[PDB]
Design a protein around this ligand. Structure first.
Ligand SMILES: Cc1c(CC(=O)O)c2cccnc2n1Cc1ccc(S(C)(=O)=O)cc1C(F)(F)F
Ligand SMILES: CCCCCCCC/C=C\CCCCCCCC(=O)O
Length: 447
């Protein structure tokens, strides 16, 4: 027999029951089937989405975001069946204490990930429009994959406190609760103070890092590209800027600090390095303006020492043998790893015609706007109530109000993992089209 000190919120919660002192648990079977089907749908929907985007669809930077975005929701749908079991038993956790920490961590892991990814998506789209020269040279899929790995690492780092402060608390009804045990580790001299501060520190930091700050970034980046496209379209209407390429002064200001701007686009800096190298100077001067700019992109992507490694490729550009140079370039490590930023360069050497990067409209815009809309509507009410239960430590009157909505708005955030794969299809015709392809392919395994 062991006794653990609890918060006044949990202590008041460990005696809540309809019938006075009994072990008979009332069961809401309507919610069991609801979350049961939600568990089934979530696993199947995100299951096929991962397959479609990840195997049948051509891999891009944007699809990589969506891929991980649907990966986090897959895990959220993997812990959900254990929440169904929780309801089926009668709101009691009967699967140990460590598993309680894991199951809970998946919820917050999904939360932070979905908040960090949606931030990454907005920032990526921001760099695509605001920083065209940098984006066309460094926005490779390999980079986008490494970003996600950092985001997951930061996500699991912010779910550790939740993993730690999760515990099994016995009710008087025989029920076993799985919730916040703030006082589980290092209780201060003032229990009521360390109970309030830690709960507030959790609810607030969660609200910021996984909701307010993302929505701030999303709304702020959305305004950046809107003004940029307006100023860009104004430049496009000008007759003199018909054949111009690699602009930087779209953001206004001056070119005095181009070598210091994050996400660098300093074209002049690259040119000075080209004229300095013995293997690049005679090749640069022999090229026309369109092909000279394509050479600047190569030293942007792999440096000047990297482009000087292609001896009998510069030998080809110097002799204006474009096609035979194209063959040699497309058979390298540089093209094999990052084909999209490479092919755009090679074709320029081939045709001598500039293909504008800031000309290409953004993709999955309908998708992200929908996913963002759902994210704000499903995690919205949650953070509201969760901030109120941290507020309810001081105000006991809010405690009954919390448990009239918190179980609802929490399951509302759970259903965000079910909504997204549907939203993927409804806003992305290619994704839906690619799905009905494989759907028809498998169904044709009867003939
Ligand atoms: C309300 C809730 C949260 C919110 C949070 O932990 O901040 C949460 C996070 C991860 C997984 N589930 C969660 N549930 C649902 C839940 C959890 C515990 C209990 S209890 C106190 O009976 O053990 C009830 C409920 C619910 F409200 F859904 F019934
Ligand atoms: C129905 C429940 C089970 C769900 C099964 C999930 C199906 C997985 C689908 C294919 C994943 C293929 C991954 C290929 C993408 C590679 C990109 C990367 O390495 O991150």
């Amino acid at each position: 027999a062991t006794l653990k000190p609890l918060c006044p919120i949990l202590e008041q919660m460990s005696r809540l029951q309809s019938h006075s002192a009994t072990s008979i648990r009332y069961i809401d079977h309507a919610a069991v089937l609801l979350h049961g089907l939600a568990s089934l749908l979530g696993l199947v929907e995100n299951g096929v989405i991962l397959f479609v985007v990840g195997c049948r669809m051509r891999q891009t930077v944007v699809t990589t975001w969506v891929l991980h975005l649907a990966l986090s929701d897959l895990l959220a749908s993997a812990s959900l069946p254990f929440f169904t079991y929780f309801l089926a038993v009668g709101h009691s956790w009967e699967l140990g204490t460590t598993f309680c920490k894991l199951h809970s961590s998946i919820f917050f892991l999904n939360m932070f990930a979905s908040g960090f990814l949606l931030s990454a998506i907005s920032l990526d789209r921001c760099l695509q429009v605001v920083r065209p020269v940098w984006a066309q040279n460094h926005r490779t899929v390999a980079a986008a994959h490494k970003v996600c790995l950092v985001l997951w690492a930061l996500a699991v780092l912010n779910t550790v406190p939740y993993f730690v402060f999760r515990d099994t608390i016995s009710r008087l009804d025989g029920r076993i609760m799985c919730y916040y045990n703030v006082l589980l580790l290092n209780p201060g001299p003032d229990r009521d103070a360390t109970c309030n501060s830690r709960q507030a520190a959790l609810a607030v930091s969660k609200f910021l890092l996984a909701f307010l700050v993302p929505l701030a970034i999303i709304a702020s980046s959305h305004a950046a590209v809107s003004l940029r496209l307006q100023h860009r379209a104004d430049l496009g209407l000008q007759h003199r800027n018909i054949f111009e390429m690699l602009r930087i002064d779209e953001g206004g200001g001056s070119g005095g600090d181009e070598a210091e701007k994050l996400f660098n686009q300093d074209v002049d800096a690259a040119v000075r390095g080209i004229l300095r190298n013995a293997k690049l100077k005679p090749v640069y001067d022999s090229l026309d303006a369109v092909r000279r700019a394509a050479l600047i992109n190569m030293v942007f992507q792999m440096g000047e020492t990297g482009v000087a490694g292609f001896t009998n490729s510069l030998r080809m550009l110097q002799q204006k043998r474009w096609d035979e140079a194209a063959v040699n370039l497309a058979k390298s490590r540089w093209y094999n790893q990052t084909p999209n930023r490479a092919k755009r360069v090679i074709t320029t050497f081939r045709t001598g015609t500039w293909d504008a990067y800031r000309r290409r409209p953004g993709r999955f815009v309908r998708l992200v706007a929908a996913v963002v809309a759902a994210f704000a509507l499903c995690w919205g009410p949650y953070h509201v109530f969760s901030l109120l239960e941290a507020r309810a430590h001081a105000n006991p009157g809010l405690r009954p109000l919390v448990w009239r909505g918190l179980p609802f708005v929490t399951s509302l955030a759970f259903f965000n993992s079910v909504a997204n794969p549907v939203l993927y299809v409804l806003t992305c015709p290619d994704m839906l089209r690619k799905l009905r392809r494989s759907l028809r392919t498998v169904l044709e395994s009867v003939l």
